Design a protein around this nucleic acid. Structure first.
Lengths: 772, 99, 276, 54, 103, 96
RNA sequence: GGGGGGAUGUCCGGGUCGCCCUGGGCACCUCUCCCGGCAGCCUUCGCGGGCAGCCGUAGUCCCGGUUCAUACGUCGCCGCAAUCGCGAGGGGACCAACGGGUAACCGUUCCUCCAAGCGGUCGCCGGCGAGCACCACCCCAGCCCCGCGCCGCCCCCA
């Protein structure tokens, strides 16, 4: 293995503008109702300043980046709202969960509901007014009659309906009297009492029924100097009735709600507050701001309505633009997103008791491709595809010549304003394919010269795209869930090779067996969108897997009489316990004509199929998950991908690396301890104490420890049917590990993306706050 | 500058500069070595800027010329200090010839 | 302290005496019990003991270990007989290296206590309700409120009268005052030396500081002006108690030493005076 | 972009323009975006961006 | 003339000694930025091995954790580098061969 | 640091309110190729004369005079003349 | 760093020629104790001592990749005393350096004179005026900034 590290691929970051849990909390049950609370679909939606809305699954500490949908050019986001109905009970007591609808704002007069099943924007709805600068749903007491409230720049509170799957602007509640007031932060103290922080240093309290004005709260001048408008950056409501609001001086104010007047001011940050969070029981307060710094606050014992800061700390490296908190199924967390592209999640109930978690700033898909025969590396973003050729091996160099060794070869820019979802290349690099949510396009390349192979039959885009290794099949995940393939024919002529695509042929996925209440509740027909696709090394077998854990495979029957039929053993292929993150055929062929399918799911579940037998390989029957090594079992790192060897497989997450010998069998992070869904516990220096020793017996020799709390037969058979593994974390920001040629030896490109202040936006300072 | 050597933060004061900033500071230095009344403090700062911004003299040749125009006064600053002592001996035993 | 043995309140003396170097023991004495020089052994603890204070009366005592703290709560009430003088103890580790501390007793009973503790990292942990948190085997999750301002060691931390201000001072010659009702700080910023010690008047009126250059200043509140001023010889002293920042391995560890004799001249024409 | 209108002086002949966003996403308003940007950046100054460069 | 060339040969010998130190550590495999061509770097500077001590507030010092040490070797890494693993690494015995682009 | 030693000498007057006031400051009281660490100081018990020895090896004798450049006497604005000490004598020392 | 070893790879006499070795070159892993600190735990008030000690190097499940900064009390005007500076503009040297041009030479930076004028610091046993107010509310014009439409010019194809 010869490795080439790379940092010249400037994958641009984007400022997270929205963090949004699909639930703020779940009602707490014991262990005996876990079977009831199992099928609750809980996710986290995030919006970044390139208009990218991405959904992750918490997975009780997993945080698998499920889907990324990017928006077009000059398209950002700033807000995000989930709309979950209360839970339904069927006629026989079966539970239908609340269908959670997703809404966003695209810095327009328009609010956009998004469809994640077809993976695009579902609906827009626009009123004739200014531009919306905060919005949210009316809370729950009505039952089926819920509404959307949106405040804007001119002021006028616009009111939308959300029921019967409709998104229509109804009417204006009220506009500000002044023409100089901007509505900047929204919250709801009651079902019908709305509290909005607003640019002219006000927090206006309205009632939504007749659009009336309860009260106004005032904020002074910033005695930090000029700019005598205070900007009420955030408002949040305590569940008991009090109101808290973060502001422009970095202060935070606490307001009694039954009279809507301030009981207390706290001077916390030095520059502005940008976001707040409250514990789901209404106990802890979190304040994150552009001093790249965030604090937590508790109620004072004794005196009512008085709170104080417990502490503060810098977690991020840029501001903390948005956040969202969750407290459910034993996981109390808050996710904070800013502009350094790295989400940071914190425990709520174990704050100061467990370490945080820096999620990968880079996307789940590696977004790096290689034609190893051509030694071409590939990376796409907003409209362009960028290609480098390496033109040399590593043993030739084994300083001054590595600069000529790498080369910025090519850069193509897509037309229109869409974004490249995915891309595929042929093994020799002569065929390129770019997939947008609007269309898919192919480009033939001659070593450059690029021509546009035009696609017929499409017109609706696709989510995933693969090209067969023999350069005959092009398959795509169209609209997430719709797998569809077209043959391409390579006709030679005196100028060279040319390629004509046939009609897209549809291949019907298998009718899976899901109960109707599960099909309706949650996000509905959602996980059916697929995440991973694979042709065999000879492109005779196709296999696809979704976010649910289902895998549908297909065989290619020859007589162009070639057509793909269903593999009958796909029925015997069972559904995975988790979402498969990586799947790949073995390029080393078997001896019985079957294939060997290596799959890893997001619980790091490693296994291998003999799919024509419809069963696991015997090596997977032997090596179990308890047989797996602990540095792979404890990673807290979703496996970004695999590269193959003859008898080895080299795995990589985002910060981790492994190699395993698939021929051989196999024989710090704690396991039985129970935490929140982020980080390990503290060991050395935590604000909570660790050893609490009571002392009876006045000689001090007798003490106490006061706790601080609020297949044997199967392995017999699997051994009667009858190491080389390695790991490191010495390549932290891995964004791509792609093979190239020129147990066999292979060259490989390890491209990373460290974050710098140069990539980062710049920090603005007035005279007072000048950081040391 | 006496204050920033006395409270020891000249190194902090100069280690974070940019191209144009060291252009200005070098221009001040090259202007003001020639006064011996603060030549010591100035050459301390000159030592520090040598330690801190000699790397990109090839990356930015206009600053290399400024690095040169540092010398381009200094090569005659040897002659001022030397001819000082050349004159410095011319006085001392004419005083001895008095007695 | 002053406690009621049967019906008479008298002075009890609590002596913290080392038994090894890394351990010590606390022993209570009456007047007659100190005369007979026998004592009531209350607690021995084994982590490099520093100090001990107690509340008014004798309900609660507090021993300062290096990283932990021991709290003794008198088991019986009203103290009928002398011999039933027993204190329930729980130990627990402060996250920083303890330099000093103060307590306000939340009160005609003793309903609670609130303890501020200062450490040489430059930090103040205030614990809100220790008696209610440790009266309840199992206890709830305790967490102090953090207060970091000073870079070097903090030396002297106390409460302001009705306890609304966390008053303090240390090495960096700034009398610092945590606001504790809002997020602000108020400081009398430039003293002549490191703040060795802070003490409070019986009323909330008069502060008195001992300052590292052998000095003492008694001020009145919000006047902050020298209302009583005393200074001493200010000489270089070999410190009995060595230093409060000599605990966490600074770049230069300050060492009690005298490398040169002192420079001084008596004034002629006025031999009653001397410059030094 | 949208084709500009052709006036006879009195009447405005316009081709209607609705082909930009088929299903993708609404195009953001950079004007309001700059408003929010300056409203953050009220009167402050930034830092020197990188290190040693022209 | 002797003092002029006194200065230059003094600094040349000093930088050559520190370069012996750095290339000894690079042959060990500590991956420092040292020169590769036969000409003098204009900056007479070498990448020292990372100070295991970390200075904290106010003046206290704790040892550098391996996490920040890896952060520091990462920032010392360059834009493009061939980092060849050995089978002696794969069994766990020896180290890699690193060649970064000449910066 | 032994090069970058900085050694001030300051002459002061004192008022009967124990006031210490500057009259002069000399930066270089003992100088050869680099500065000379000044070794000792002594007062004439009968006259306003201060002798001092440094690493130069010379002992220097300083006496206060009246600030008067070219007949114009420099008086403090209350009227009193400005006094200023000066190296009245220099004595080199023979070495063995 | 030394003193030393076991082992990796290497050339020159080489050896029946192989295990490698002696003679020269050696770089490394390892072990060894003597260098510098760091901890704990007993000892003695301390001075000191003892005890089993780690580290002098590299990439982590997450993660300290952190936590940290020094006051109000009053401002404005202009006058005196000591003290320094910038210089508009008008003059000299052509020293040096740079970049072009062989060169001549040019240009740029610099060195220096004279100076209109101008500030800045401390001490004013100077004077003089004024303290919310350099604010609230509102409105009209204005500099900047940014957004789009209209023209003006230049485009090309035509």
């Amino acid at each position: 293995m010869d490795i080439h590290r790379c940092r010249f691929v400037r994958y641009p970051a984007s400022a997270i503008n929205a963090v949004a849990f699909t639930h703020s909390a779940l009602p707490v049950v014991s262990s005996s109702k876990k079977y009831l609370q199992k099928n609750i679909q809980v996710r986290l939606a995030i919006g970044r300043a390139n208009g990218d809305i991405e959904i992750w699954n918490p997975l009780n500490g997993g945080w698998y980046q499920e889907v990324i949908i990017p928006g077009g050019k000059d398209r950002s986001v700033d807000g995000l709202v989930w709309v979950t109905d209360p839970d339904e009970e069927m006629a026989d007591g079966k539970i239908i969960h609340g269908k959670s609808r997703l809404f966003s704002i695209g810095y327009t007069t328009t609010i956009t509901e998004w469809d994640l099943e077809k993976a695009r924007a579902k609906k827009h709805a626009s009123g004739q007014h200014g531009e919306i600068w905060c919005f949210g749903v009316q809370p729950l007491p009505a039952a089926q009659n819920r509404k959307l409230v949106a405040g804007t720049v001119d002021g006028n509170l616009v009111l939308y309906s959300i029921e019967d799957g409709d998104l229509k602007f109804q009417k204006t509640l009220t506009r500000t009297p002044s023409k100089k007031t901007k509505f900047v932060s929204i919250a709801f103290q009651s079902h019908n009492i709305v509290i909005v922080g607003c640019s002219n240093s006000t927090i206006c309290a309205y009632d939504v029924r007749t659009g009336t004005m309860l009260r106004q709260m005032t904020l002074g001048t910033d005695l930090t100097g000029g700019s005598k408008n205070i900007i009420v950056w955030a408002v949040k409501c305590l569940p008991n009735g009090d109101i808290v609001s973060g502001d422009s001086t970095g202060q935070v104010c606490i307001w009694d709600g039954k009279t809507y007047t301030q009981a207390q001011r706290i001077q916390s940050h030095t520059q502005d507050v940008l976001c707040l969070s409250v514990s789901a029981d209404g106990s802890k307060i979190i304040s994150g701001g552009m001093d790249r710094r965030t604090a937590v606050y508790e109620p004072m014992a004794g005196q009512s309505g008085r709170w104080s800061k417990v502490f503060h700390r810098r977690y991020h490296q840029h501001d903390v633009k948005a956040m969202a908190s969750f407290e459910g199924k034993g996981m109390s967390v808050v996710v904070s997103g800013g502009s350094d592209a790295s989400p940071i999640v914190l425990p709520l109930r174990a704050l100061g008791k467990e370490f945080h978690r820096t999620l990968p700033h880079l996307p789940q898909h590696p977004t790096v491709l290689s034609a190893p025969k051509a030694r071409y590396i590939l990376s796409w973003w907003e409209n362009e595809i960028r290609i480098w050729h390496l033109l040399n091996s590593a043993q030739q160099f084994l300083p001054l010549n590595l600069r000529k060794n790498r080369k910025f070869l090519a850069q193509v820019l897509i037309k229109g304003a869409s974004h490249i979802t995915s891309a595929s290349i042929s093994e020799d690099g002569t065929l390129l394919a770019a997939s947008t949510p609007t269309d898919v396009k192919v480009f033939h390349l001659d070593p450059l010269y690029i021509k546009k192979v035009n696609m017929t039959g499409t017109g609706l885009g696709a989510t995933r795209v693969q090209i067969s290794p023999d350069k005959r099949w092009i398959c795509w995940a169209e609209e997430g869930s719709k797998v569809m393939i077209s043959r391409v024919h390579a006709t030679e002529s005196a100028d060279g090779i040319s390629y004509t695509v046939s009609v897209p042929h549809k291949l019907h996925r298998l009718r899976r067996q899901i109960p109707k209440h599960i099909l309706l509740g949650g996000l509905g027909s959602y996980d059916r969108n697929v995440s991973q696709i694979a042709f065999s090394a000879d492109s005779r077998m196709l296999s696809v897997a979704d976010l649910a854990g289902y895998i549908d495979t297909w065989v290619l029957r020859g007589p162009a009489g070639e057509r793909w039929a269903r593999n009958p053993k796909a029925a015997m292929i069972p559904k995975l316990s988790a979402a498969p993150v990586v799947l790949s055929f073995s390029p080393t062929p078997r001896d019985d004509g079957d294939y060997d399918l290596l799959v890893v799911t997001t619980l790091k579940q490693l296994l291998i199929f003999n799919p024509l037998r419809g069963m696991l390989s015997e090596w997977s029957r032997r090596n179990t998950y308890p047989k797996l090594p602990e540095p792979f079992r404890d990673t807290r790192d979703q496996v970004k991908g695999i590269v193959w060897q003859g008898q080895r497989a080299w795995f990589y997450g985002v910060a981790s690396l492994f190699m395993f010998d698939l021929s051989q069998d196999f024989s710090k992070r704690k396991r039985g301890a129970h935490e929140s869904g982020a980080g390990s516990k503290i060991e050395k220096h935590s604000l909570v104490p660790q050893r609490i020793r009571a002392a009876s017996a006045p000689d001090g020799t007798k003490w106490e420890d006061i706790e601080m709390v609020d297949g044997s037969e199967l392995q017999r058979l699997r051994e009667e049917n009858r190491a080389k593994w390695w790991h490191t974390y010495q390549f932290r920001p891995i964004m791509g590990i792609v093979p190239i040629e020129g147990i066999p030896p292979l060259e490989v490109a390890l491209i990373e993306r460290p974050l710098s202040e140069d990539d980062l936006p710049e920090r603005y300072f007035a005279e007072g706050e000048w950081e040391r | 500058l006496t204050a920033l050597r006395h409270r020891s933060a000249l190194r902090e004061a100069l280690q974070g500069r940019d191209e144009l900033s060291v252009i200005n500071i070098l221009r001040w230095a090259g202007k003001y070595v020639a006064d011996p009344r603060y030549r010591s403090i100035c050459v301390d700062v000159a030592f520090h800027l040598i330690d801190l911004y000699a790397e990109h003299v090839g990356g930015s040749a206009e600053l290399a010329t400024q690095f040169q125009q540092l010398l381009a006064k200094v090569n005659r600053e040897v002659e001022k200090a030397e001819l000082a002592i050349v004159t410095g001996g011319m006085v001392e035993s004419l005083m001895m010839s008095v007695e | 302290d002053a406690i009621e043995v049967a019906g008479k309140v008298d002075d009890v003396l609590l002596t913290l005496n080392r038994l090894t170097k890394s351990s010590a023991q606390i022993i209570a004495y009456n007047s007659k019990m100190l005369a007979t020089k026998t004592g009531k052994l209350l607690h021995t603890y084994d982590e490099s003991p520093q100090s001990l204070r107690s509340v008014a009366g004798g309900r609660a005592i507090v021993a300062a270990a290096k990283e932990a703290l021991h709290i003794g709560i008198l088991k019986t009430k009203k103290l009928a007989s002398w011999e039933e003088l027993a204190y329930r103890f729980v130990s627990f580790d402060v996250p920083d290296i303890i330099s000093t501390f103060d307590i306000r007793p939340i009160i005609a009973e003793l309903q609670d206590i609130d303890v501020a503790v200062g450490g040489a990292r430059g930090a103040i942990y205030v614990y809100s309700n220790l008696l209610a948190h440790l009266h309840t085997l199992r206890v709830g999750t305790i967490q102090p409120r953090k207060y970091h301002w000073h870079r070097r060691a903090v030396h002297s931390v106390k409460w302001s009268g009705d306890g609304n201000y966390l008053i303090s001072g240390g090495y960096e010659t700034v009398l610092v005052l945590w606001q504790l009702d809002t997020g602000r700080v108020d400081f009398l910023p430039h003293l002549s030396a490191a703040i060795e010690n802070i003490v409070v008047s019986p009323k909330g009126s008069a502060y008195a500081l001992h300052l590292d250059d052998n000095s003492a200043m008694v001020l009145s509140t919000a006047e902050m002006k020298p209302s009583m001023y005393v200074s001493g010889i200010q000489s270089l002293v070999l410190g009995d108690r060595p230093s409060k920042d000599a605990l966490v391995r600074r770049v230069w560890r300050p060492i009690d030493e005298i490398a040169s004799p002192l420079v001084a001249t008596i004034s002629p024409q006025n031999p009653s005076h001397m410059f030094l | 972009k949208n084709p500009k209108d052709k006036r006879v002086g009195s009447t405005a002949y316009r081709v209607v323009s609705n082909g930009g966003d088929p299903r993708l996403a609404p195009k953001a308003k950079k004007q309001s975006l700059n408003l929010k940007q300056a409203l953050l950046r009220r009167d402050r100054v930034a830092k020197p961006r990188g290190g040693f460069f022209v | 003339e002797a003092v002029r060339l006194k200065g230059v040969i003094a600094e040349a010998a000093n930088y050559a000694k520190r370069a012996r130190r750095a290339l000894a550590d690079s042959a060990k495999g500590k991956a420092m930025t040292v020169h590769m061509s036969a000409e003098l770097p204009l900056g007479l500077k070498t990448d020292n091995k990372i100070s295991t001590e970390r200075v904290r507030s106010g003046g206290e010092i704790v040892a550098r954790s391996s996490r920040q040490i890896g952060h520091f070797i990462s920032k010392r890494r360059g834009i493009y580098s061939i980092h060849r693993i050995s089978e002696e690494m794969l069994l766990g015995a020896a180290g890699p061969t690193v060649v970064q682009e000449a910066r | 640091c032994k090069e970058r030693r900085e050694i001030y000498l300051k002459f002061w007057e004192v008022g009967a309110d124990q006031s210490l006031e500057l009259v002069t400051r000399i930066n270089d009281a003992h100088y050869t190729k680099q500065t000379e660490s000044i070794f000792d100081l002594a007062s004439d018990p009968t006259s306003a004369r201060f002798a001092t020895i440094g690493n130069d090896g010379m002992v220097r004798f300083w006496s206060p005079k009246l600030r008067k450049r070219d007949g114009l006497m420099a008086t403090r604005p209350d009227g009193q003349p400005l006094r200023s000490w000066s190296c009245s004598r220099v004595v080199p020392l023979p070495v063995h």
